[PDB]
Amino acid sequence: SENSVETQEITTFHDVETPNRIDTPMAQDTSSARNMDDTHSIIQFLQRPVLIDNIEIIAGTTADANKPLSRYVLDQQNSQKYVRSWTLPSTVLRAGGKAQKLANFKYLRCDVQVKLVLNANPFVAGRMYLAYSPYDDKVDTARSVLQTSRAGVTGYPGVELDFQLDNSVEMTIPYASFQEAYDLVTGTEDFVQLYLFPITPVLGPKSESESSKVDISVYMWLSNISLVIPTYRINP
Amino acid sequence: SENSVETQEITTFHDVETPNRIDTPMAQDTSSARNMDDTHSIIQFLQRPVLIDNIEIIAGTTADANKPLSRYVLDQQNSQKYVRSWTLPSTVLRAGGKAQKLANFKYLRCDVQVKLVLNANPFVAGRMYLAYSPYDDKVDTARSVLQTSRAGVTGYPGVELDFQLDNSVEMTIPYASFQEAYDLVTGTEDFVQLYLFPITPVLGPKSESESSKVDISVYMWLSNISLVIPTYRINP
Amino acid sequence: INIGNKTNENVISFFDSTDAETQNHNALMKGCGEFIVNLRTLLRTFRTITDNWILQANTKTPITDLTNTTDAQGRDYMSYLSYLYRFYRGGRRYKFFNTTPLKQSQTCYIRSFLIPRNYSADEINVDGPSHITYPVINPVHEVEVPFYSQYRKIPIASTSDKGYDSSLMYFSNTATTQIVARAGNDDFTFGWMIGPPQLQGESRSVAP
Amino acid sequence: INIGNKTNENVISFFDSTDAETQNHNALMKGCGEFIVNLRTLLRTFRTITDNWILQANTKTPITDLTNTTDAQGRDYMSYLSYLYRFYRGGRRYKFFNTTPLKQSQTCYIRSFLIPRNYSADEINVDGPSHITYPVINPVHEVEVPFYSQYRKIPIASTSDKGYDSSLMYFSNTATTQIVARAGNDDFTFGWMIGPPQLQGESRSVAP
Amino acid sequence: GRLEIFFEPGVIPVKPTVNNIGPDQDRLTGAVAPSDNNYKYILDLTNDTEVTIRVPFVSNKMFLKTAGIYGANSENNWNFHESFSGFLCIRPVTKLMAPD
Numbered sequence: 001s002e003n004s005v006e007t008q009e010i011t012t013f014h015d016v017e018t019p020n021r022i023d024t025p026m027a028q029d030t031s032s033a034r035n036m037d038d039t040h041s042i043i044q045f046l047q048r049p050v051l052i053d054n055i056e057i058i059a060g061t062t063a064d065a066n067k068p069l070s071r072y073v074l075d076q077q078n079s080q081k082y083v084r085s086w087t088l089p090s091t092v093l094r095a096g097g098k099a100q101k102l103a104n105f106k107y108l109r110c111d112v113q114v115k116l117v118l119n120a121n122p123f124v125a126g127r128m129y130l131a132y133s134p135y136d137d138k139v140d141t142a143r144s145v146l147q148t149s150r151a152g153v154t155g156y157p158g159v160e161l162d163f164q165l166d167n168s169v170e171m172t173i174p175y176a177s178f179q180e181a182y183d184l185v186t187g188t189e190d191f192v193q194l195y196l197f198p199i200t201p202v203l204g205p206k207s208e209s210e211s212s213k214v215d216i217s218v219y220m221w222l223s224n225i226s227l228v229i230p231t232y233r234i235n236p
Numbered sequence: 237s238e239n240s241v242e243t244q245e246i247t248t249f250h251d252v253e254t255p256n257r258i259d260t261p262m263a264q265d266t267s268s269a270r271n272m273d274d275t276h277s278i279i280q281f282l283q284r285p286v287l288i289d290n291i292e293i294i295a296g297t298t299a300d301a302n303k304p305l306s307r308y309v310l311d312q313q314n315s316q317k318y319v320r321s322w323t324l325p326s327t328v329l330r331a332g333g334k335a336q337k338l339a340n341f342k343y344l345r346c347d348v349q350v351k352l353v354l355n356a357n358p359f360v361a362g363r364m365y366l367a368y369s370p371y372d373d374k375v376d377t378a379r380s381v382l383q384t385s386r387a388g389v390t391g392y393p394g395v396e397l398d399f400q401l402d403n404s405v406e407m408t409i410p411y412a413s414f415q416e417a418y419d420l421v422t423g424t425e426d427f428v429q430l431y432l433f434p435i436t437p438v439l440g441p442k443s444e445s446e447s448s449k450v451d452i453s454v455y456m457w458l459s460n461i462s463l464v465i466p467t468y469r470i471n472p
Numbered sequence: 473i474n475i476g477n478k479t480n481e482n483v484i485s486f487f488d489s490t491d492a493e494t495q496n497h498n499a500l501m502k503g504c505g506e507f508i509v510n511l512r513t514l515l516r517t518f519r520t521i522t523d524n525w526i527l528q529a530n531t532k533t534p535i536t537d538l539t540n541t542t543d544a545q546g547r548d549y550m551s552y553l554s555y556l557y558r559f560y561r562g563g564r565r566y567k568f569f570n571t572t573p574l575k576q577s578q579t580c581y582i583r584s585f586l587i588p589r590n591y592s593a594d595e596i597n598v599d600g601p602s603h604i605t606y607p608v609i610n611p612v613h614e615v616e617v618p619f620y621s622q623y624r625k626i627p628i629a630s631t632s633d634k635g636y637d638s639s640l641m642y643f644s645n646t647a648t649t650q651i652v653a654r655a656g657n658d659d660f661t662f663g664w665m666i667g668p669p670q671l672q673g674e675s676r677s678v679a680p
Numbered sequence: 681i682n683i684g685n686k687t688n689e690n691v692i693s694f695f696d697s698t699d700a701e702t703q704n705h706n707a708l709m710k711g712c713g714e715f716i717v718n719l720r721t722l723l724r725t726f727r728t729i730t731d732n733w734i735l736q737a738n739t740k741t742p743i744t745d746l747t748n749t750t751d752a753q754g755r756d757y758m759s760y761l762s763y764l765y766r767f768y769r770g771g772r773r774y775k776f777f778n779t780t781p782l783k784q785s786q787t788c789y790i791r792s793f794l795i796p797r798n799y800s801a802d803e804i805n806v807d808g809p810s811h812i813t814y815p816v817i818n819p820v821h822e823v824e825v826p827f828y829s830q831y832r833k834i835p836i837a838s839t840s841d842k843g844y845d846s847s848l849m850y851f852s853n854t855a856t857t858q859i860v861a862r863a864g865n866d867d868f869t870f871g872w873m874i875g876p877p878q879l880q881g882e883s884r885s886v887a888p
Numbered sequence: 889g890r891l892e893i894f895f896e897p898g899v900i901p902v903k904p905t906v907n908n909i910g911p912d913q914d915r916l917t918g919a920v921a922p923s924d925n926n927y928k929y930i931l932d933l934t935n936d937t938e939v940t941i942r943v944p945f946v947s948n949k950m951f952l953k954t955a956g957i958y959g960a961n962s963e964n965n966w967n968f969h970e971s972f973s974g975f976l977c978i979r980p981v982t983k984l985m986a987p988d
Contacts, residue, residue, distance in 0.1 A: 391667020476682020
């Protein structure tokens with residue numbers, strides 16, 4: 001009669017009395033959408049793998065995709081040559097429609113998974129290396145992966161990427177930032193910044209009209225997430 | 237070695253072997269976003285009340301907001317006069333940013349709550365009635381609420397809306413459709429269609445420059461929801 | 473006594489001789505015999521919806537050429553309780569009483585079939601569950617449509633979807649004018665109560 | 681609902697992840713180490729009240745020639761918490777850091793004595809509990825004034841009574857400019873809380 | 889009447905001037921800044937009067953700064969943003985109903 005303080009998700013009210021609320025006579029169950037699928041939570045929804053990139057290699061090669069790793073890097077013009085650059089988590093959040101499903105939240109504590117499905121013919125050899133380097137375009141110039149030697153590139157954490165032995169890799173890129181719980185509104189996140197390096201050049205028969213392809217693909221999804229503070233904004 | 241079939245949220249893979257996956261050495265906990273708020277599920281997120289409409293009444297009144305309920309309705313030109321029309325659930329889904337949080341789903345089994353916070357001065361009397369009518373703009377003309385008499389309007393389900401006795405109402409509008417589990421993609425949902433009728437005209441002193449206001453507001457949120465099938469589309 | 477308002481609901485009563493439920497049994501046992509309780513029981517009695525339906529000879533006629541007309545009036549009990557409710561489930565039993573000036577130079581017979589709701593004449597087939605009577609030996613056509621629906625319940629006068637439960641097609645050979653009566657089957661019931669619409673009285677139409 | 685008013689106090693809370701007192705230990709163990717609790721502990725640390733105090737040679741100088749000036753500013757912790765309180769008890773430790781261009785044709789030394797508060801130079805004697813340092817071998821003068829009062833506690837900037845507790849007299853021989861730092865002794869504490877006065881910000885002094 | 893107080897974490901909308909920082913009520917109006925997802929409290933002026941709104945500390949860092957408004961202007965306003973974890977906001981749901 002005096003105490004009407006009820007609680008919604010994140011919302012509380014303050015009335016004089018309980019305002020004479022009427023409702024359903026009996027809450028009988030109806031159409032069977034509950035019996036067709038269980039409800040997917042928002043921590044369950046940010047664990048779906050997405051098709052991000054589709055990298056094709058031909059050897060070849062006129063392009064930069066088969067320049068091998070330099071044994072020495074003597075100057076910043078002749079930096080280390082790579083394939084692609086994924087600037088996590090700003091790539092994994094925008095793709096797959098995730099950012100239009102974690103809107104109206106503020107802080108995030110994620111761990112990015114990376115999987116490489118690989119599919120090449122038996123008549124082609126080679127080897128790559130999938131290194132990640134946190135703050136790789138924030139730290140001073142000499143400390144980045146793109147300026148060190150071949151022994152220094154491979155010494156970074158990662159996994160071997162041989163063709164005939166590995167058709168799938170599982171790498172767990174950790175929560176690797178100094179700030180507690182990544183900001184989203186006015187976001188400049190870009191903490192861990194991934195790379196893909198070829199160690200040996202891709203090898204095939206030197207006669208052409210043969211089409212020695214590689215066709216890498218990249219899957220990423222989050223893990224061990226905690227999504228906490230509600231807001232009204234978001235970056236587009 | 238042969239059996240690599242793993243399962244994500246809603247996603248399965250098929251490789252030759254387990255592709256030599258490396259991961260974190262030890263998964264040590266980090267920044268404390270988990271300790272600041274518990275994770276809000278998507279069934280938890282569609283239970284937040286939203287400020288939809290803000291209806292102000294002055295008596296007055298030149299406008300249609302204080303034409304009382306007609307005792308008889310003799311012709312369709314002189315239909316029943318109301319305040320506002322909420323065509324559920326197409327109002328509650330678009331507002332509050334909910335539809336940009338239930339994208340990439342297909343079927344929904346909701347129950348719409350309606351609450352009216354009311355705040356008027358003690359020197360003003362009157363009474364309203366909050367009726368809902370399913371398929372009110374789909375059925376034939378004679379069966380709608382807007383064509384029946386005052387005894388027929390009030391005979392619909394609803395709640396009294398007196399000023400001095402009720403500062404809050406709680407109405408539970410059920411899942412009231414024939415189709416199992418409301419469609420979302422190419423949606424023409426509009427099943428239950430709410431109304432707000434004044435029974436007596438709002439009464440105050442007939443001398444003006446006195447400002448006899450009413451200032452109703454409407455809160456709506458879903459309940460007992462089940463959200464099941466994943467798709468790639470959605471309506472904008 | 474203070475300035476404010478309370479609710480303090482009072483169910484105060486007038487004449488209090490005996491309990492009400494006891495006298496109603498004693499009143500109907502001497503005046504009725506029959507004790508009408510549930511309106512579900514009135515959807516089992518065949519009230520005549522038309523008095524005359526002059527059907528043109530050799531035409532597969534859907535009953536929706538009469539049902540769209542005769543659900544407006546509320547003459548029977550199905551269309552009079554079509555206003556107090558919104559949904560329905562269950563099949564509709566139909567009886568057809570022949571009132572034709574029959575002719576001996578023909579052999580009159582009556583067929584019946586199924587169409588889904590609101591289809592037209594030519595856009596459906598004819599091999600289905602049938603029934604046949606011969607009005608020389610049997611003037612009554614005793615037909616029950618089942619409830620073969622996609623949905624668990626049906627609202628009245630729906631949207632642009634069609635063919636979502638089944639109803640009757642009526643085929644004859646000669647120009648038979650009839651009486652049509654109906655009620656729901658054993659498991660026909662409404663639901664989802666609303667308030668009732670208006671009524672119409674007498675229309676004597678005085679000159680001034 | 682009646683015309684009137686109530687109080688019905690509501691301590692309603694926002695974010696409620698974990699207990700607050702538990703996370704504050706975990707936050708300081710990784711960011712501080714040191715866990716500051718009581719403001720009584722900040723009256724034990726010698727914060728420098730002046731950077732330069734050019735004392736004229738051969739003059740018995742009371743520190744109240746500097747204390748009346750430097751209790752206004754609130755630069756240290758003694759005069760900054762002179763605004764949140766009214767009374768105080770306990771003696772004031774003083775340290776004197778020599779910053780003089782010393783000269784070899786003299787033997788520089790430093791004395792110290794006691795006067796009761798707010799007396800002038802000549803109206804007190806000199807035989808009392810003393811201390812002496814030699815700044816050629818020891819640049820720091822490590823002196824603690826005790827709490828020798830008539831009253832159990834002292835309000836700030838009192839009336840026309842004077843000489844009601846003891847403080848320092850500072851005697852040298854040469855024109856020694858110094859640094860002076862201070863805090864209260866082991867049993868120095870304020871009391872009788874009031875509300876705080878204002879603060880002063882930056883004074884960049886733009887032309888228009 | 890009904891009065892709403894809602895939290896918002898993060899950057900406060902401002903107006904840098906030559907010598908002071910004022911808040912920006914052009915961005916907190918509407919229908920351009922909803923209050924449907926924030927933590928809120930809807931007090932009632934009928935008979936309820938007071939409320940105490942305890943706001944615990946949550947913004948992505950172990951400690952904020954104690955600069956506040958000192959030297960906060962058009963030039964030097966980084967420390968003002970990194971010192972608060974947002975703002976309460978008192979805006980009315982329903983307008984004040986008062987007789988003459």
